[PDB]
């Protein structure tokens, strides 16, 4: 079976390239919800509905014009606060915009919040 967080990313990336505005995503987990909810806070996606089908789960989402790309990293590497900027420079296009998402004892947070809260964690994914 495919990784659920990988499946999420390819589904939205392809649909964006094909110039569609909305998609249905077919297998959902707890961190998939939290990832989508992160993209909504930063205004990359607009509307979210979750379907409680008793068979795994599924979501319907509206895409914005601001989303260029997103992706998951596998495996989920452990990082000290000293390490995160290395990954930031590898993944993101510019020092000015975009988000690298990290899981922590305080939920999902971005590479700026890591400095504010003074915490590393595990690397999860990115979008710009």
């Amino acid at each position: 079976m495919m990784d659920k967080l990988a499946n999420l990313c390819i589904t939205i990336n392809n649909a964006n390239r094909a110039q569609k505005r909305s998609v249905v995503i077919r297998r959902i987990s707890k961190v998939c919800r939290l990832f989508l909810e992160s993209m909504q806070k930063h205004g990359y996606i607009t509307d979210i509905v979750y379907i409680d089908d008793h068979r795994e789960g599924k979501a319907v989402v509206g895409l914005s014009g601001r989303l260029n790309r997103c992706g998951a990293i596998c495996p989920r590497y452990d990082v000290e606060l000293k390490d995160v900027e290395r990954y930031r420079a590898n993944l993101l296009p510019s020092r000015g915009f975009g988000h690298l998402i990290v899981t922590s004892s305080k939920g999902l947070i971005d590479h700026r919040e890591c400095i504010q809260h003074n915490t590393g964690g595990k690397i999860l994914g990115y979008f710009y």
């Binding site: 505005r21 909305s22 249905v24 509307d47 509905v49 379907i51 089908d53 068979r55 599924k58 319907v60 989402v61 509206g62």
Partner: protein
Amino acid sequence: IAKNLLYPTVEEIKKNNKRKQLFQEVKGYFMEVKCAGCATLNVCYSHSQKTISCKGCSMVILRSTGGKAKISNECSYMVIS
């Protein structure tokens, strides 16, 4: 979102496979069949895996097949569940 994607038309529902939908659909249902002549009522399943005979008169009322089962020529039915 699009209305077309969140709320499909009933036409679209009927064209899709029973699993490949926002919510999966039951296709089998229960019926009350009444025998020609003796007018007794028997509960039956559509898509039956077993041949069934009328209570009392023992006429074969329903024949099992590879798909939806076949009601004998004279008999008639109503959906109950």
